[PDB]
A paper describes a structure:
LysM domains, which are frequently present as repetitive entities in both bacterial and plant proteins, are known to interact with carbohydrates containing N-acetylglucosamine (GlcNAc) moieties, such as chitin and peptidoglycan. Here, a structural study of the Thermus thermophilus NlpC/P60 endopeptidase containing two LysM domains is presented. Glycosidases, such as muraminidases and glucosaminidases, hydrolyze glycosidic bonds between carbo­hydrate units, while peptidases, such as amidases, l,d-endopeptidases, d,l-endopeptidases, l,d-carboxypeptidases and d,d-carboxypeptidases, hydrolyze amide bonds of the peptide stem at specific positions. d,l-Endopeptidases belonging to the papain-like peptidase superfamily possess an NlpC/P60 domain which is responsible for their catalytic activity. This domain is commonly associated with PGN-binding domains such as the SH3b domain, choline-binding domain or lysin motif (LysM).
We also report a co-crystal structure of P60_2LysM (P60_tth with no catalytic domain) bound to N-acetyl-chitohexaose (henceforth referred to as chitohexaose), which sheds light on how LysM domains cooperate to bind long chitin/PGN polymers. The structure was solved to 1.75 Å resolution. Monomers 1 and 2 are identical, while no electron density was observed for the LysM2 domain of monomer 3. Monomers 1 and 2 bind chitohexaose in the same manner, but differently from monomer 3. In summary, we observed that LysM1 of monomer 1A mainly contacts the last four GlcNAc residues (GlcNAc 6 to GlcNAc 3), while LysM2 of monomer 1B mainly contacts the first three GlcNAc residues (GlcNAc 3 to GlcNAc 1); this LysM2 domain could also potentially interact with a fourth GlcNAc residue if a longer chitin polymer was present. The recognition of GlcNAc 3, GlcNAc 2 and GlcNAc 1 is achieved by LysM1 and LysM2 of monomer 1A and LysM2 of the symmetry-related monomer 1B. There is a strong difference between this intermolecular dimerization mode and the intramolecular dimerization mode observed in the crystal structure of fungal Ecp6 bound to chitin. Our structure offers an alternative binding mode that could explain how LysM receptors dimerize and signal upon recognition of long chitin oligomers. With our crystal structure, we now claim that both events occur, since each LysM domain in the asymmetric unit binds a chito­hexaose molecule which could also be bound by a LysM domain from a different monomer. Additionally, the structure of P60_2LysM bound to chitohexaose provides the first structural evidence for intermolecular dimerization of LysM-containing proteins on a GlcNAc polymer.
Residue numbers in the entry: 16 to 114
Amino acid sequence: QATYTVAPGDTLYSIARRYGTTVEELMRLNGLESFLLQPGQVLKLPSRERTHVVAPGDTLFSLARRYGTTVEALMRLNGLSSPEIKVGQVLRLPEEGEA
Ligand SMILES: CC(=O)N[C@@H]1[C@@H](O)[C@H](O[C@@H]2O[C@H](CO)[C@@H](O[C@@H]3O[C@H](CO)[C@@H](O[C@@H]4O[C@H](CO)[C@@H](O[C@@H]5O[C@H](CO)[C@@H](O[C@@H]6O[C@H](CO)[C@@H](O)[C@H](O)[C@H]6NC(C)=O)[C@H](O)[C@H]5NC(C)=O)[C@H](O)[C@H]4NC(C)=O)[C@H](O)[C@H]3NC(C)=O)[C@H](O)[C@H]2NC(C)=O)[C@@H](CO)O[C@@H]1O
Ligand SMILES: CC(=O)N[C@@H]1[C@@H](O)[C@H](O[C@@H]2O[C@H](CO)[C@@H](O[C@@H]3O[C@H](CO)[C@@H](O[C@@H]4O[C@H](CO)[C@@H](O[C@@H]5O[C@H](CO)[C@@H](O[C@@H]6O[C@H](CO)[C@@H](O)[C@H](O)[C@H]6NC(C)=O)[C@H](O)[C@H]5NC(C)=O)[C@H](O)[C@H]4NC(C)=O)[C@H](O)[C@H]3NC(C)=O)[C@H](O)[C@H]2NC(C)=O)[C@@H](CO)O[C@H]1O
């Protein structure tokens, strides 16, 4: 069970984007009803997601932001020959140490 300790200025959103998860998942996992956090608060983190099925409207930029990584990592991991992507494509996502 990975955790993250809240620092001044952190929000559920900024933490979610850094770790490649969502506000709703952080709240579900930690039983939160409020966006109010205090420095020192320990938050349980979800496991890294392993794959994403590409949907209409997705782009490598947007998926890099969603999963806390980079276009470059997503391209390398999936052997992509250009920065464009296809509906239905299954993209492998980075592990914690390589995002
Ligand atoms: C490089 C580039 O340009 N990239 C862009 C992408 O960035 C862009 O994606 C969009 O990006 C937007 C900007 O990041 C984003 O908008 C933001 O959305 C989030 C989520 O809805 C908003 O988050 C809320 O922010 C408020 C403050 O504005 C937070 O309130 C603060 O909460 C803290 C923590 O609890 C609290 O601090 C505590 O305060 C008490 C005293 O009251 C103190 O005792 C405690 O010690 C203290 N705690 C700590 C830990 O410090 C603080 O008081 C309040 N503040 C106030 C004033 O009350 C909310 O908690 C927070 N919500 C959540 C759920 O986290 C944020 O405000 C939005 N910013 C803006 C500018 O709108 C977009 O959502 C995002 N969109 C997408 C689709 O991703 C994309 C797309 O355009 O384009 C490029 O890629
Ligand atoms: C038709 C159409 O599609 N139009 C498009 C249009 O929507 C697009 O414009 C964009 O719209 C979106 C969605 O509206 C905008 O995104 C929103 O942005 C705002 C501002 O950043 C966010 O507002 C914050 O919302 C949070 C909740 O999510 C608020 O937090 C809550 O605050 C209340 C009030 O204090 C708290 O209630 C109090 O709670 C205490 C207990 O703590 C209780 O004792 C009190 O009684 C209680 N008080 C009351 C009065 O009830 C409450 O607890 C707290 N919630 C939590 C969980 O802690 C926060 O205060 C809001 N911030 C501000 C500031 O007001 C909003 O979340 C966000 N929504 C989304 C979905 O992101 C977006 O900004 C906007 N963009 C632009 C450019 O305009 C446009 C363009 O995209 O396109 C059109 O087509």
